[PDB]
Write a protein that binds this ligand. Sequence first.
Ligand SMILES: Nc1ncnc2c1ncn2[C@@H]1O[C@H](COS(=O)(=O)NC(=O)[C@@H](N)CCC(=O)O)[C@@H](O)[C@H]1O
Ligand SMILES: Nc1ncnc2c1ncn2[C@@H]1O[C@H](COS(=O)(=O)NC(=O)[C@@H](N)CCC(=O)O)[C@@H](O)[C@H]1O
Lengths: 456, 489
Amino acid sequence: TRPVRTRIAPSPTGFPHVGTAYIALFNLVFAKSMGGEFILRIEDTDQVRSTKQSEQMILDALKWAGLSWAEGPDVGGPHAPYRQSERADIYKKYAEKLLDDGHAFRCFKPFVIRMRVPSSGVCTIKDMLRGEVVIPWEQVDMQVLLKTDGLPTYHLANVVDDHLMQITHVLRGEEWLPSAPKHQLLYEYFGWQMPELCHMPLLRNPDKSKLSKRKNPTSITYYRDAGILPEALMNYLGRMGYSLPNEQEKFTLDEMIQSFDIQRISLGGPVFDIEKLYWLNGEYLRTLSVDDLKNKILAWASDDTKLTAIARAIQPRINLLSDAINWAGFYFQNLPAITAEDFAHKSLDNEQILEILYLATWQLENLPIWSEENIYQTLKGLAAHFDIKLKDFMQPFFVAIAGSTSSTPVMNSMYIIGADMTLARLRHACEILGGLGKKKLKKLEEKNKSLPNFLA
Amino acid sequence: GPGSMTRPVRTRIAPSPTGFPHVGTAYIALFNLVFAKSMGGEFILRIEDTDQVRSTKQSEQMILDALKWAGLSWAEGPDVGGPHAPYRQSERADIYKKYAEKLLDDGHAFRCFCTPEELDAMREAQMAAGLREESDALVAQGKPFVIRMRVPSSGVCTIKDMLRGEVVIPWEQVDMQVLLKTDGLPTYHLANVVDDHLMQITHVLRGEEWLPSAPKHQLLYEYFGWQMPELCHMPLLRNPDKSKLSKRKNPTSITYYRDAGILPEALMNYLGRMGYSLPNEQEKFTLDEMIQSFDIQRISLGGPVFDIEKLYWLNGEYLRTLSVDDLKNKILAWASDDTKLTAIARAIQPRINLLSDAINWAGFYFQNLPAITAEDFAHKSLDNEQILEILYLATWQLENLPIWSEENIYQTLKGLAAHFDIKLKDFMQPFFVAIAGSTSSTPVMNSMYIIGADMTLARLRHACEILGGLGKKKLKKLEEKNKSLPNFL
Ligand SMILES: Nc1ncnc2c1ncn2[C@@H]1O[C@H](COS(=O)(=O)NC(=O)[C@@H](N)CCC(=O)O)[C@@H](O)[C@H]1O
Ligand SMILES: Nc1ncnc2c1ncn2[C@@H]1O[C@H](COS(=O)(=O)NC(=O)[C@@H](N)CCC(=O)O)[C@@H](O)[C@H]1O
């Protein structure tokens, strides 16, 4: 055959997603079972949305989960650079070869290169799991390969980098199956061998919808912060679309590798029941030594939360070393115990309060960098646009973030617990307060886009 | 002034190791240490374990550890050694016997074939308003005797106080104190004079409670032909209500404030301010600053009040003057040392499904006094007046435990529930709230073992205060029952 080589190719656009870890697990397990290697390629082709910080978050998140790669942006490799943004020169020449070869045309002076697509026939793709995929060529668009800025699109860079990095198997979400005919065609146009394709079912919520941050948290780093062990999380993800022989519910990475058979992957959309993940974490915690449990609690508290920042926040308010527990306890909880009645709506109407927390969630979600200043500018700008006094605007945030009406300055608190935990606590607060109906929620999303950029 | 001293200055703290180390012992130790260092002299420690039934080896280590934590240190003592070792009175029994006999030979002490409890009956005897070869023969017969000191029947005693001037006490008010007991071991009064003379103590600062005993000590120094040390009687620390410092309102144990999060520097700063004020009225100062500007005459004689709230505020001032980095390290060090985390992890493991739950289950281990209300204890099965009775007896029984070990806590509480014929499940219901602040928590008896003796007792007495306590009359009945109870161990 040929040396097996798999990959995870995360687009560093936003929070590190559990789904990205789901795919990363099944690519690493597949490779190792076949004596191959697992590499990581950062796909930062969306220049405006891809951030250097978001790249470091994903590498840190997967390393924490226990995944590792033989070649990548950090470790290096014979196929460096491993960021697509630093491969811009490579893609341009191949796109020009597609123009000379009679396989691409320009569409409008500013120009974009587009691929030629057959006008009649079918595309037959072999999926390792679903069998055979047939797609009419007429339902395949003439996708843009090189943009006006000279930078690549996803479809061009994936084919060039997979071929140059000698990828032999690609496992990715079934969302990318409609793009597969484009990929076969590009490999033919370049005279290259297309890797074998296995499309994976997409993780779902309990309501059978697609996994959404709305219904259940979706960030890898949130589960770190909430107290989930990385060994438990990876165990749960390997159990989602897949079952080990004999239906073992708790297993290690090495156990998954040895008995790994791609055909055991179910096609139903796996449901990410956070409660079942929590129980499994309980099993991992109870099978630990008391010494190990102690050391794991201390490490979980020394790394995620910054203690020098917690000390500075509580110093004005503690008169005894024993007060630290009552003033800094919420920094180490997951979701403070709150009730609807706690939001006294004495300054703001309850319907107002919901609108403040929803808009604050979305605005804080898209922050380029999680700094106390960016939090302050965003929340001050939001209170400015609606003409509410800031102290009255922040009243709900004391309840949602700290679980009490009195605490250290809530904005430094949000900076300390982090982006993932702040948003998890805001979304929880909306749910306790009943949320807003589908009709009201869409209207509020409209205003969110009409809002200014509170940081420009 | 240091130069106007006849002899090298030497002070002392002489704690009786008969329970938890009390803040008062730290107060006195501070002013003897500061006085000595100010005069170029030395501070020593002598353990006064003459009450054998009440003195514990554990209690001796408790005081030495407590004073070292507070920042006190001594040039000579049971641990460091010294030219006048041993520094435990229990190991100086030989010395006291001979000096007690010398007082018999000089005719300054007499033998009484009474025994100390019989003597108390003799002194209580009713009498009208207006009023030895045989003893040696009784010594041959082996009858038990106690040596007693002779006291003049008429006249006055003038005691020189460094602060009060001259204190005059009619000799009629001075009893013929026992110097040697039936066992041949010393009493406090004989051992103090003999040891102070032998350890070359030049100044003695001690509570004003000992002022009535001063005439006796002056008399013994005369009988031995020894120079009496100068006496400076210190005002006694008081409660906010102006009573003598009592455990009811606030804990009196040095180690409780360590466990509660008071820094040692803040506690010594507060104690240095109680009867005394630095020049220029600095409210916050270090030990060395106190030494440099120390003047014995600045000690006020009004009873200082030990306001726990003011101690807490001063501790806050110490916390704010720390760098954020130092405050971090001090909080962590305070939590790693006293409580062992391996036991807390053991306790929460059966109950936590997330690492984040650890904070909610183990928070009470690091709190000082959990937030409690009367209503928290009452939706249970037991009447409040019962609950109060359970907590008071549990406090006293757990206080007198020889060792703080989970089995001893278990035997004590199980026997108490047996004597009341209350089921253990209902008997422990109040202790869950008093120790953890909730109806559901880790097993409370392991919890009490972990937080320690001081914190367990502080939280139980607090539980009594919120529940209103028991009246003075109700409390007397309960103390009677406490002694009538069997040994639950
Ligand atoms: N709910 C879900 N359940 C399960 N898998 C899910 C998922 N959402 C996304 N994925 C899958 O996660 C992987 C990485 O996602 S991602 O960062 O958005 N990057 C991308 O989608 C592209 N870089 C795809 C590259 C490729 O695979 O060829 C991709 O393989 C993507 O299909
Ligand atoms: N509330 C209070 N405020 C302030 N000082 C107080 C105090 N209660 C006790 N003291 C003082 O503490 C010192 C040691 O106390 S103790 O362990 O009971 N030992 C004794 O009283 C004697 N063995 C001391 C002998 C001596 O000094 O000559 C003794 O000096 C004692 O007077």
